Design a protein around this ligand. Sequence first.
Ligand SMILES: [Mg+2]
Ligand SMILES: [Mg+2]
Ligand SMILES: [Mg+2]
Ligand SMILES: [Mg+2]
Ligand SMILES: [Mg+2]
Ligand SMILES: [Mg+2]
Ligand SMILES: [Mg+2]
Ligand SMILES: [Mg+2]
Ligand SMILES: [Mg+2]
Ligand SMILES: [Mg+2]
Ligand SMILES: [Mg+2]
Ligand SMILES: [Mg+2]
Ligand SMILES: [Mg+2]
Ligand SMILES: [Mg+2]
Ligand SMILES: [Mg+2]
Ligand SMILES: [Mg+2]
Ligand SMILES: [Mg+2]
Ligand SMILES: [Mg+2]
Ligand SMILES: [Mg+2]
Ligand SMILES: [Mg+2]
Ligand SMILES: [Mg+2]
Ligand SMILES: [Mg+2]
Ligand SMILES: [Mg+2]
Ligand SMILES: [Mg+2]
Ligand SMILES: [Mg+2]
Ligand SMILES: [Mg+2]
Ligand SMILES: [Mg+2]
Ligand SMILES: [Mg+2]
Ligand SMILES: [Mg+2]
Ligand SMILES: [Mg+2]
Ligand SMILES: [Zn+2]
Lengths: 75, 159, 104, 213
Amino acid sequence: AKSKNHTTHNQSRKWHRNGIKKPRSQRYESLKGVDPKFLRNMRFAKKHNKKGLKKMQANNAKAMSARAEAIKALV
Amino acid sequence: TNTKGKRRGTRYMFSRPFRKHGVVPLATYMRIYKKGDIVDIKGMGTVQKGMPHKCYHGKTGRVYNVTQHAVGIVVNKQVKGKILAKRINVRIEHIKHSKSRDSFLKRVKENDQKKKEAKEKGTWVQLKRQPAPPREAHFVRTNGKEPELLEPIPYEFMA
Amino acid sequence: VNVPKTRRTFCKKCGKHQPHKVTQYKKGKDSLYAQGKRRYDRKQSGYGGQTKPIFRKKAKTTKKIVLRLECVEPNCRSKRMLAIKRCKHFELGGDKKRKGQVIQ
Amino acid sequence: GRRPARCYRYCKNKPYPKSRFCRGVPDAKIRIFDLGRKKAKVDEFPLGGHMVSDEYEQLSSEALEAARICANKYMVKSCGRDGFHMRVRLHPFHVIRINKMLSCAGADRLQTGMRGAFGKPQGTVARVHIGQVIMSIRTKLQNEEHVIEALRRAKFKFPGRQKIHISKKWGFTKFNADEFENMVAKKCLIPDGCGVKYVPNHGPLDKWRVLHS
RNA sequence: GCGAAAGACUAAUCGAACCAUCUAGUAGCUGGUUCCCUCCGAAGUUUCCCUCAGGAUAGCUGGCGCUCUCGCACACGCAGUUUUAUCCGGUAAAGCGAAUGAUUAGAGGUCUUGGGGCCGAAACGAUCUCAACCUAUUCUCAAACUUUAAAUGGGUAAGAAGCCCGGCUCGCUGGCGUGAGCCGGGCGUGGAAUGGAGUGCCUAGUGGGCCACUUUUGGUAAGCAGAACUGGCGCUGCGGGAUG
RNA sequence: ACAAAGCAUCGCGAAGGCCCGCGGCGGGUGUUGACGCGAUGUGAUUUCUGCCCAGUGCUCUGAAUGUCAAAGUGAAGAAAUUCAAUGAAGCGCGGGUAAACGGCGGGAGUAACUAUGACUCUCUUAAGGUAGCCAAAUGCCUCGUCAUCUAAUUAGUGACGCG
RNA sequence: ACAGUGCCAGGUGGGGAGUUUGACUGGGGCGGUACACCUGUCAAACGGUAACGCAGGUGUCCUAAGGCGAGCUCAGGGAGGACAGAAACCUCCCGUGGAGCAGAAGGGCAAAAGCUCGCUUGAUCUUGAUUUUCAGUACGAAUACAGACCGUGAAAGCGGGGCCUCACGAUCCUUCUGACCUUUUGGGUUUUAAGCAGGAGGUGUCAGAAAAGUUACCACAGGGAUAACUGGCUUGUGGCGGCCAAGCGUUCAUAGCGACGUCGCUUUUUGAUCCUUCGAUGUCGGCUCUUCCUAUCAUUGUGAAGCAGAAUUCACCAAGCGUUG
RNA sequence: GUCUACGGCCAUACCACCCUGAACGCGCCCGAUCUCGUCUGAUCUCGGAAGCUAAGCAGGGUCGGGCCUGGUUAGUACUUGGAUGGGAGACCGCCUGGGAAUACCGGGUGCUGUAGGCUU
RNA sequence: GUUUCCGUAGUGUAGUGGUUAUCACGUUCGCCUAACACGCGAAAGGUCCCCGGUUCGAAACCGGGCGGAAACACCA
Ligand SMILES: [Mg+2]
Ligand SMILES: [Mg+2]
Ligand SMILES: [Mg+2]
Ligand SMILES: [Mg+2]
Ligand SMILES: [Mg+2]
Ligand SMILES: [Mg+2]
Ligand SMILES: [Mg+2]
Ligand SMILES: [Mg+2]
Ligand SMILES: [Mg+2]
Ligand SMILES: [Mg+2]
Ligand SMILES: [Mg+2]
Ligand SMILES: [Mg+2]
Ligand SMILES: [Mg+2]
Ligand SMILES: [Mg+2]
Ligand SMILES: [Mg+2]
Ligand SMILES: [Mg+2]
Ligand SMILES: [Mg+2]
Ligand SMILES: [Mg+2]
Ligand SMILES: [Mg+2]
Ligand SMILES: [Mg+2]
Ligand SMILES: [Mg+2]
Ligand SMILES: [Mg+2]
Ligand SMILES: [Mg+2]
Ligand SMILES: [Mg+2]
Ligand SMILES: [Mg+2]
Ligand SMILES: [Mg+2]
Ligand SMILES: [Mg+2]
Ligand SMILES: [Mg+2]
Ligand SMILES: [Mg+2]
Ligand SMILES: [Mg+2]
Ligand SMILES: [Zn+2]
């Protein structure tokens, strides 16, 4: 009652017919896997961002009016 | 049927090459890795802690972690069809900066530079690479010789 | 193998290492008004034959020894279990083997 | 005794050297891969006559024996006992196998047929590639014919097919015969019993100082 | 039940009757399975199995679909492709005067030492001889060797998720910075060739396969046994290969 | 082949042996009584019935300090309880029994041809195959060896016998 | 006052019942374990790959045989040095690694991972992520991080067992520990019991059946996926035949022979194999009767001989008719 | 040029031997009051500074071993695809691409990183 | 062929866990005996089959072998 004990025969044919998809990689992949002491921290970075938006907005408008003046001084 | 053990068939991979049996040159763990950087795995005998394993000895992947003496690294591994982008935790010793990317970067730095310049001209410069064209009509010249006559040489049995 | 009788290590309740007293564990006497048994008895009672399993097919020749640590400092006394690899010969504080000595 | 050479004529398998891995090897039939005046000199004995295989095959140890002997017999006659060297250059050495004869008694009842098919050591054989030398001989330049035919008889203990060829070297060296008398007289080459040392313009000068002295 | 005993006999019935019912008993096992046409269209491959005649799940298939692109002078993507970079790789070959392992031969050496001689009481005394070692050599080899070391092969990469400016946050890290995260602005075809791309359910059959080139393991050899790689047949005719 | 007659064991004095039945104060032997009933073994006649109770059985006014339930009695407790001592038969020990199942062995030297060996070493075991018998319906090696019967015999008979 | 019957308990009970009595497996039965793992190889240079392919190991042991930390240098050889000799003891020199590193190998290792000592418990408690076996499920084993509490070290670090690859195991069951934990229920208190979370008992067929035989008295489903004939292939063995040629043959190779070697056929020997057949092709011999082959024992015609005759072997055409009681 | 301190890549650096050291250091050296360590101040620690380049080291040398390149062997060996090529078979031939290794010949012999000297 | 079992003094045979080797017999020497037996006192004798490995060390523990033994080789 003996038989075959493997083969990897047509096969190439199969796990290949539908393709072999090189894994569709998004931007913005998961941070799960990373050392907790990164995340522990970068969440205090991410959480206390808005504290410091007043600077951010004014300091934007400074650069925006300085570059409205740079492009207008070119004109 | 064979043994599954993690380090079968590694007798002669992980084996350090020649006359390098010993102190791991220190440079190889004082160059900086950081997430995004592409890295070639290359297993090593000397240090066994934080080894990769043969099914990715000699692959490349990007780095996604950096721990105190290891680098979490995402590599693609083929497995009866479906390739799996998958993540391992390999100690620095077994890793390098692949220069794979580093033709491009030097090609970028050149193209942005050659585009910003020749914009004040407006002349269109050949930015893309292009495969090796057919070799152009040239001439040759002999001067004061005819060429040398070859004859196939008569066989005699050497031993 | 061998192990010593004392053993400074983590006492859960203290939140600290402390000296523990090592001694190996033996099984309890088996309860009889434990649910499992109560049910094994009186399924297997009445005019029925044997119901539940019993091996006649051992294999290994050795059990994982278990140390029964307990905290020396009083009021802790919080005993904790610490399993160990297998050995077919196990001792507590039986000498320190020596080095460089004559083997008579 | 053994199956006829036929069945182990051809190299199918990877070399089985007698080693740790196989053991209980019966000692190789052949034992002397040179005879005659192996006490000769290079300078008195100038004719590297050769026997060369033309086929990728295996040669039994017991063929090599015969092949040798029948060349010791014809040379002797021919040249005399002192007047040659013969060298065999294939010491049999990958080991050949035999399933253990499918032994059974009378009508029999059980052989098990194929289980544990792997045999035992039977003997020993040489690997031989094409254009590769098997036997070589040296004599006097005089006595060419008497080499030719000695190897000629040896071909007939010996399967497949194989040419007899006369070399361009001093006897048993690698140094092309048109060239010794010169290369010795100036000492690129220095006599060393059978063979000869090539001495180059390399080592310390006091090595030279000994020659041309 | 009955047997002077032979598993004899119990009404053509006996290793233990016949009749009815439970009764559609159960069956991984034989056999069969009923109208047309159109389209796509296998597997005998994966791991667990009281598993080897079967199941479990890997596959491959169909159907059902959906998200979009745009061939509507005005496309990104993907890929049994190929280049250019770049790693990875230990097979063929080779070598073995590079390690290990075998092994021939001579020159050489009281190396050592020996054990026999022969000439010596005996004497590295003479001369032989053979052991072993080793100094230059040479013959020939290794699947469980390797200094070298291909061909064929396997990763990446060849940009908009990309460069380049500005600025903020942090409990991590540090003499300061890093590092990471964010906001804000500045900047486009980035080797060839091909073709519209994406992703979600149900899910049958199948899970005995066989053959060829080349590679290759058993075997002596087979139409023998077992792998690789590819190619077939199964599953599918036809011209040829007289036949197959 | 079975039976058979003959030989042999074995239980049984009826609140019994053996036995039936589902059950009764049920039934067969049994309208019986050991010269009977039941249970076996071998197989007329003649001659004989060798050793072994080391195993397993069987069995025995045999100790049962071996253990051992129920109940029974001891105790703590608040109770389920829990923990004590004691303890049948069979189980553990000791005898008997083989016309119960059965079993019944290897090694050297040593004699005046050679050989062989009356003799004398070991060792083991529960005894260690005795009288016979044997190439038998038991013998692998096997056309055992010798005799006879045949012109010729793997056939037959007669001997031999480490069987 | 037991006999006796009622009913529990323990023994004894193929007298009787039901049941089981692995798989792998050149058929099977008896041989092994290829039933879980681990080295070297096959294995065709990313990974993977079989057979009862090879060549081997494992079910281990360690209070340290780990963690640090320190300290030194290993096998072997030479030259020296009382007794002392191929080996005790010492000292110099050489000593890439020939030692050593609990074990199979395999990889790894030197002011180390080799050796010696001091200090000890990082073999400790705790979430998560990943690798490996992959379905990419478990277990086992590993890798990286993080949080406690600690050893060591001037310190950097290093250390969650044992330089890396094996060295162990579900459900249900049992036990021990842990928390002023939850339930124990119409309330409450104590026992008791059930949870919850960690450890142990264990399935050796290693993802985990509580299990002896025999059937020639046998049965049913099946089976050419499994044997015993026939047939194919194969040809080891058998038989037959060449070549080379050392010899024998008084001498002389080859009249006749012919070693050590070597090249073939043949299918009248046995093996392998398992292609056909298991809705079964009658299974050994004997008789009779045909026909064919030649692998010529006779006879016809021939060539050989070491052929004088006589007698005899070698060979050719040759299968014409012979091969008996 | 050169050295020291710390270094990178780890022999073009190693090894074997030969030659020369101006200054500063680098060394050799001298001793054990303390620290510290030993059987021994043999090594380590420490306090020094009476000598000399004796060696290291440094600097140089060798038709020197070695290592590192080149060549050669060699378009050889081997190989991707290829054919209704040859060959009884082993094997061999060609077509399309790729293409090693030894012996044998050559050349070279460590480059520099920061901090600090000296030759003012 | 496959599965077992042995091998130790001149011979038959003990023995241990890894430090050590026995018994009986045999034999050599005395004594007793007129002389042999018997009896009594003294004595010497193997690489623990050949190996490689482990180990402080092996007769004894692995692996290989060599010699002597036993046991299976069932359906056709
Ligand atoms: Mg009951
Ligand atoms: Mg019967
Ligand atoms: Mg390999
Ligand atoms: Mg087949
Ligand atoms: Mg009887
Ligand atoms: Mg009797
Ligand atoms: Mg008895
Ligand atoms: Mg008798
Ligand atoms: Mg008779
Ligand atoms: Mg008759
Ligand atoms: Mg029964
Ligand atoms: Mg079976
Ligand atoms: Mg491969
Ligand atoms: Mg250290
Ligand atoms: Mg921690
Ligand atoms: Mg260690
Ligand atoms: Mg209640
Ligand atoms: Mg109440
Ligand atoms: Mg019968
Ligand atoms: Mg078949
Ligand atoms: Mg079929
Ligand atoms: Mg047949
Ligand atoms: Mg003659
Ligand atoms: Mg019929
Ligand atoms: Mg003829
Ligand atoms: Mg001093
Ligand atoms: Mg100096
Ligand atoms: Mg000097
Ligand atoms: Mg040189
Ligand atoms: Mg074609
Ligand atoms: Zn505590």
